[PDB]
Chains A and B, each alone.
Chain A
Amino acid sequence: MFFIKDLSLNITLHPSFFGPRMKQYLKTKLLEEVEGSCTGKFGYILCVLDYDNIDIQRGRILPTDGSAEFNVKYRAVVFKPFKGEVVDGTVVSCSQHGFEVQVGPMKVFVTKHLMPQDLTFNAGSNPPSYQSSEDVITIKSRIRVKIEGCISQVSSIHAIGSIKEDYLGAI
């Protein structure tokens, strides 16, 4: 599920930094406008690998100002969930309408009615929870969810998942 996709980016550098250690600045700016980014087509850019052998190529100088433009070809560890993906995480928030599990950098939420039946929701609990014949789900409890649908948004990705199938529930 986590991936290692081969990407590339374009950074426009002002002449100012056309210094001796330019390579250094580039890379650094690569990492500012990448690590922690988010797209629906790439998912989560989490970490740039092989920091060293980052290919810079020759950048061309634009044509009104001196800013130069290099196509930085890198490689990193991405992660973008899918509908029908099975993943387990740590619960965080839990309310009358359901609880939200946190799978990695993302947050998957489970609808009360997307859970089973015999599982009710106890509001008068502290911390808040969901009780069952034998199961007890609350804050720190670990669950395994099945992602039913995804929704991209700004700089993140949420999604709804169910625990109404088999081999699904706490662990």
Chain B
Amino acid sequence: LRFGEMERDCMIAHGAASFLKELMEASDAFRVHICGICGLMTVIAKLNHNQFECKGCDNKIDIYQIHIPYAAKLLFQELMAMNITPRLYTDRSRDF
């Protein structure tokens, strides 16, 4: 089925970042992990022994889970490969 412009425009509205990248429940939808430090997909989630890590920004404690449209994940990964960093943060610090 289709998840086009309009259905995207709503997910952006909803502010449902991850689901977009993954509009969602009926198309993409994907569950990725992040570092609460460096907002990337780096994280090495072993959903079993709960181990989580993220060497580099080195973590194990501060880690999130977000739902985003796979396409979006890919949007990001593709960006990173072009050396650009898309940071995913779960809290607003800039106010307003």
Contact = CB atoms under 8 A, between A and B. Distances in A.
A touches B in complex, CB < 8 A: yes
Interface of A: 8-14, 26, 29, 32-33, 37, 57-72
Given A63-B66, A64-B32, A71-B37, A57 B61 contact: no
Contacts, number: 142
Contacts of A63: 17-19, 21, 31-32, 34, 64-68, 88, 90
B89 A60 contact: yes
Given A68-B90, A68-B91, A62 B34 contact: yes
A67 B37 CA distance: 12
Contacts of B31: 63-65
B33 to A, nearest CB: 6
Interface of B: 17-19, 21, 30-39, 43, 52, 54, 57-68, 88-93
B25 to A, nearest CB: 14
Contacts of B92: 58, 60
B61 A13 contact: yes
Given A64-B30, A69-B89, A71-B37, A11 B64 contact: no
Given A12-B43, A69-B63, A62 B57 contact: no
Contact of B35 (A10, A32, A61, A64): A10
What does DSSP make chain B's interface, helix, strand, loop or mixed? loop
B67 A67 contact: no
Given A12-B35, A68-B91, A61 B64 contact: yes
A68 B36 contact: yes
A61 to B, nearest CB: 4
A11 B36 CA distance: 5
Nearest to A11: B62
A12 B91 CA distance: 12
Contacts of A13: 36, 61-64
B32 to A, nearest CB: 5
Given A61-B90, A65-B64, A71-B37, 4 more contacts: A12-B62, A13-B62, A32-B61, A69-B64
A62 B88 contact: yes
Contact of B90 (A29, A32, A33, A62): A62
A62 B66 contact: yes
Which of B52, B66, B90 has the most chain A CB atoms closer than 10 A to its own CB? B90
Nearest to B66: A63
